[PDB]
Amino acid sequence: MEFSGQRNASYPHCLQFYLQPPSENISLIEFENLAIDRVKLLKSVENLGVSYVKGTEQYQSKLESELRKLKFSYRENLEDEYEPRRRDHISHFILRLAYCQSEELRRWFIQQEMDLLRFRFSILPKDKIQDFLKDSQLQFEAISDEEKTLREQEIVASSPSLSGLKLGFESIYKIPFADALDLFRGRKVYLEDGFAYVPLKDIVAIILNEFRAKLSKALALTARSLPAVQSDERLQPLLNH
């Protein structure tokens, strides 16, 4: 037998890249606290850094508690996490203007963002990787995967860092040496005829690099185009102090 009988489209994944402007409304206290709580988070990431080494389980365990406490987006949930995702999106747009006040402050918050992104990419299950790589512009197509076992022999003979198990669990796909730039110029690993046998973390490095490029362009736009919006700026001193 065959039977008969909205915000999902906004953020199909917890990951987001700020292409679309949220064309809606906000309260004063709302945008204020949405940004200010994230200022606390930015400091907290580096406080955790001075506590102990970056990205360990101690980092992971404490960091998710920060997110649950601070009500922003998560390892992706199936219930209404779209509200935290749009809060994250909106508050990100709000955060562009505070620490654009100095390039050192820009670089400071960018660095904790890269750390946070690296953590999130470290958490990812396989299904997340499979659907986000296809649903994003971050396609990076694989070629002739059956050859990977000839490189299970060759890489293992040819690399100090990589191993046969990493061929499968850091699942190997073929893309150019230039997408593994630090690995070719350091000559660290098996690459051949200009092609690299690549796990996800190299594409994460590319994601971080293009994110930095696009964000830097946005910060330049923040420095230049913003004055029509600047009818109120009372929070800026409290934010830069």
Added chain:
Amino acid sequence: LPELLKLYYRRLFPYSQYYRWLNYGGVIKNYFQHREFSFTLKDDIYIRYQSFNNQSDLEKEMQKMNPYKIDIGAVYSHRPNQHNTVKLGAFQAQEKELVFDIDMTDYDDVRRCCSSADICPKCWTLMTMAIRIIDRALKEDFGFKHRLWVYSGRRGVHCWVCDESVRKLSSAVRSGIVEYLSLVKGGQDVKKKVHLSEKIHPFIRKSINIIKKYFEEYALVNQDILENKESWDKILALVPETIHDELQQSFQKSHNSLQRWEHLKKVASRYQNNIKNDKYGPWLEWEIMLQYCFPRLDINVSKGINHLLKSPFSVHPKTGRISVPIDLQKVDQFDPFTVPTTSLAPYVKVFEHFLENLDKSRKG
């Protein structure tokens, strides 16, 4: 010299091919007019920021000045000959071929038959290996298609890589390309210049494969790299002190560099198999071979977009030789002592073959 240059720049310089090369079909607006050139004249009088609206301007200027040496620069935001008319800071370089510079004088710590700016048939085998290794890397590993190799006129060769994507490379990537192509590290006083990891990237593997075709004839026969204590001391500076006594004894017991190199490989193999935990890497043989045969470069030539490097079909003032192209199908058959000072046609044919490939790539 000037009368020979007058005749050369009138009758022999390949202007149509040169303009066809640096204009790249005229696809990009005023690209050749934005190209920089630099002229060096009698008594080393100098003129930077030359540029030409068409082939006729190029021909007129080279016949007018009759330069001893010509260098090619970047494509700029404005015509370089009109840079005095441009706003402060607005005159800037934008594009440049990926250019490599290889000189025989760079090998004076490993070659023995010659030194300084002089060359001979014994040491020029290094340039055969250098051309082959760099060109093979640029072909296979980097994937760059249009690569023009040119003899400088006395002591070395230059490679001009001319793809559009290559012309648009940034300074950082250019430096990375050189660093990747530079296994030989350090300055003139550094004793050991090549170091290898316990397991090796396939890029390096190919260099040893090329070197093996020439290492006997060059290093063991013509240079005789282990002839005597003075020669083998420089190689012993590359190896563990634990095996210096054994290697010295084996070298003394061996009659020539061939047997001495075989004994060096045997001792190195036994040491590699015996001791794991030493500071020296296991691929000692490859390190010695690479230090004595691998390409050598100046990163400043390649990284700088606005840098000036010697023009193809320019001339050398003391040898009188033309800066001719080198046929990649016949690298081993090139000879710098046969270069012209008509007989220039084969080298122009190499240039025209390169440009026919360039044009066909553009059209297809």
